[PDB]
């Protein structure tokens, strides 16, 4: 996907309003300048130039009258998703690295981010548990058949919950952010 | 790059102001909703979902008090650049398909779009002419060494012109739009 000293970035805004984003390198140099709407970007990506094979990037985010500074390390030739979320009376971000594995024909791949205060089990297969840790825990990737998943079985941990995933397309990898079960759907590059 | 019934799109705005873009499918269905600044997007891309392996997409563009409608055909698993340009007292767009060839280590790849009213020869190699037809003609791709090209030899067709390309990075493919020689630099996904 990305060339030497380059990365791909997808910005995911889970805040209740627009978020202004900049990403700086080591010398007050903007690698990305982006305005992101609430519950965007599901299918928009940017290419960032690094100064080395590895770097700590400076993510500056404006939300209302706040301008936060969050640092996250990256490695060349990788794709990342920056998840922006409301953190108390402020905002914070988490950076997740995406997989380079292409689903087999007839399959799609899915992953979860759990924002709730309780650990979740996504029960797609009963002989293959899919754990999603509380407070922004990230699940392992899982390959599934392409198709519609309107009522997926979800446990926490003596409680049962249903989750709608919508239509999953052939050869596509999805990220589901569990918000309330309710989940926001984004697509990996 | 893109999965079955998907494309990548990069929007290149050569107009003097912001351009609002929508791209529709066959049933008043938005595949992309984008606001693009003047001389952007050099490194931002979107994924579009097609309804078939091939489709004619409806590109709607707003520039000041104009809302134009331009149709361009696409094929699945391809990457495209939409070049928006001022066309008299209006705007128009052209869609170009990008190559899937990765430059060898130590190399970069480049391509030209000539907006001038005269045919151009980009003389990088004297034994390998690089023609760029007038009135938005597209040149063939050319692999070159990574490095700085501040004064490239450019002919039209008994006249000599110099062109600055800046720094070309390892493994990257570039699009140069010749505007006035003066050229705007964009990067293929
Ligand atoms: Cs975008
Ligand atoms: Cs920092
Ligand atoms: Cs963007
Ligand atoms: Cs149309």
Numbering used by the authors:
A (entry chain A), B (entry chain A): 408 to 587, 593 to 601
Text of the article:
Mammals obtain nitrogen via the uptake of di- and tri-peptides in the gastrointestinal tract through the action of PepT1 and PepT2, which are members of the POT family of proton-coupled oligopeptide transporters. However, a key structural difference exists between bacterial and mammalian homologs with only the latter containing a large extracellular domain, the function of which is currently unknown. Here, we present the crystal structure of the extracellular domain from both PepT1 and PepT2 that reveal two immunoglobulin-like folds connected in tandem, providing structural insight into mammalian peptide transport. Functional and biophysical studies demonstrate that these domains interact with the intestinal protease trypsin, suggesting a role in clustering proteolytic activity to the site of peptide transport in eukaryotic cells.
Following extensive screening, crystals from Rattus norvegicus PepT2, residues 410–601, were also obtained. The phases were calculated from seleno-L-methionine incorporated protein using the SAD method in space group P3221. A higher-resolution structure in space group P41212 was obtained using the P3221 crystals as seeds with a single monomer in the asymmetric unit. The final structure refined to a resolution of 2.06 Å with final Rwork and Rfree of 19.9% and 24.0%, respectively. The crystallographic asymmetric unit of the PepT1ECD crystal contained two monomers that formed a head-to-tail dimer, related by a two-fold non-crystallographic symmetry axis, whereas the PepT2ECD construct was crystallized in a monomeric state. The crystal structures revealed that in the PepT1ECD there exist two conserved salt bridge interactions stabilizing the interface between lobe 1 and lobe 2, mediated by Asp574-Lys398 and Asp476-Arg490, whereas in PepT2ECD only one equivalent salt bridge interaction is present, between Asp505 and Arg538. Guinier analysis of the scattering data in PRIMUS (Petoukhov et al., 2007) shows that PepT2ECD has a larger radius of gyration (Rg) compared with PepT1ECD, 23.1 versus 18.4 Å, which suggests an increase in particle size. Consistent with this analysis, 3D envelopes of the ECD generated using DAMMIF show that PepT1ECD forms a compact shape ∼48 Å in length whereas PepT2ECD is more elongated, approximately 61 Å in length. The larger envelope of PepT2ECD indicates that the two immunoglobulin-like domains are structurally more dynamic than the PepT1ECD, which is consistent with the loss of the second salt bridge and also the location of Asp505 on the unstructured loop connecting lobes 1 and 2. We identified two highly conserved charged residues, Asp550 and Glu573 in PepT1ECD and Asp576 and Glu599 in PepT2ECD, located on one face of the ECD structure.
